[PDB]
Amino acid sequence: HDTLLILGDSLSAGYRMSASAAWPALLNDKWQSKTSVVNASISGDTSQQGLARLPALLKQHQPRWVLVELGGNDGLRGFQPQQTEQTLRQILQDVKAANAEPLLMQIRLPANYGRRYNEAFSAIYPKLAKEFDVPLLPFFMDEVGLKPQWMQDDGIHPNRDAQPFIADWMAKQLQPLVN
């Protein structure tokens, strides 16, 4: 009955698969009658789009914890790292002000983007985790990517088959935090 809210993009919503197929639904199943998992993710969401939806989610779901998994789409849509940092800062602030605990997931961009860019982008996550003194979960795609059979054709998004694994991985990361 205590709720974890997942505020994510495609990596949590599921890319070209249903609600029921994505790892949060599987985690919800695994944690039935202990912890409620509410998936508030939408494919393609930027950090700014996530923040826009946040006040209505906090009021509606009154979560105890909010897992923030955003930033991956920000560069592609014209937002610089410094803008992503500030947007995430604001998200963490709203979660704490609603007396929930923020959990930040580390995001990594494709090597493709540039070495100068990736270091700056990746660096905002530990910076904010330290600044707000919150859990920083590792980027699960670092592991999922090691199995081509778990990747959709685009080489970016985990497929249906990957979702049970990711649910297991999240359950383990989140266990000490949630009961």
DSSP output for 31-49? TTTTEEEEE---TT--HHH
Q: Check 1, 61, 157, 161 and give the catalytic one.
A: 157
Copy the structure tokens of residue 115. Answer: 């070495």
* Beta carbons within 8 Å of 66's beta carbon, 6+ residues apart: 4, 5, 6, 7, 58, 95, 100, 101, 102, 103
Single out the catalytic residue among 47, 153, 154, 161.
Answer: 154
The angstrom resolution of this structure is: 2.0
DSSP 158: B
Choose which CATH entry (3.40.50.2000, 1.10.3720.10, 3.30.1360.120, 3.40.50.1110) describes domain 1-179. 3.40.50.1110
Concerning whether 33 is annotated as a catalytic residue, the answer is no
What are the residue ranges spanned by the domains of the chain?
Answer: 1-179
For the chain, report the end-to-end CA distance as a whole number of angstroms: 12
Catalytic annotation present for 10: yes
C-alpha 38, offset from chain centre: 12
Helices (H) and strands (E) in the chain, counts: 7, 5
Active site residue 154: yes
